[PDB]
Amino acid sequence: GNPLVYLDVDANGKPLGRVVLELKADVVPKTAENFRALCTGEKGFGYKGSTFHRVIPSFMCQAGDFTNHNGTGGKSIYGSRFPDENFTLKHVGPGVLSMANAGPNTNGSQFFICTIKTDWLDGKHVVFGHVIEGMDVVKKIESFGSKSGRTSKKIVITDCGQLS
Numbered sequence: 001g002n003p004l005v006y007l008d009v010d011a012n013g014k015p016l017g018r019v020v021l022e023l024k025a026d027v028v029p030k031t032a033e034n035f036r037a038l039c040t041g042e043k044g045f046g047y048k049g050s051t052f053h054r055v056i057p058s059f060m061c062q063a064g065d066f067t068n069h070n071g072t073g074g075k076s077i078y079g080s081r082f083p084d085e086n087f088t089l090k091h092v093g094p095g096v097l098s099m100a101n102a103g104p105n106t107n108g109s110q111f112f113i114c115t116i117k118t119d120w121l122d123g124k125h126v127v128f129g130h131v132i133e134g135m136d137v138v139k140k141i142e143s144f145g146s147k148s149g150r151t152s153k154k155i156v157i158t159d160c161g162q163l164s
């Protein structure tokens, strides 16, 4: 079945709780596998101890730059970048999990969780999962963002991994 993974998130060292995500390995196996492995840390790098560096209220919460912590970095389990797998899954509403990118075929490790329907991204960002549980936690993260994307508190993935 599809992987169930988790992110435990704090704000300035205070727990906000757990986001549980389903990864759609049945539709985007390569993209799913990348995210799953970055949650477990099994390749010797990944998301644990990294940040949500760009959070825009009424839009999305962005994370995954575990090298530079500012949107310029990250890498995949495959190498520095990997192709756009497919655009089968769409940005249908809040809780969609999708890959951030710098253009076509530039997926690395950065990702975003939508807090609205972001359909203008369809065909441009690879959607690969959604929030199973903890949309309230996502909303808390969202609350520490700003229209610029800068966060007012340090938002940290203190733990992460795979439930099933």
Ligand SMILES: CCOC(=O)CNC(=O)NCc1ccc(NC(C)=O)cc1
Pocket (backbone or CB within 6 Å): 060, 062, 071, 072, 073, 080, 081, 082, 099, 100, 101, 102, 106, 107, 108, 109, 110, 112
């Ligand atoms: C809603 C999300 O909007 C975006 O993706 C806007 N673009 C963005 O944040 N780019 C950060 C980024 C920079 C480099 C890569 N990768 C590479 C070089 O391999 C992946 C992502």
Ligand SMILES: [K+]
Pocket (backbone or CB within 6 Å): none
């Ligand atoms: K806007």
Ligand SMILES: [K+]
Pocket (backbone or CB within 6 Å): 040, 159, 160, 161
């Ligand atoms: K863990």
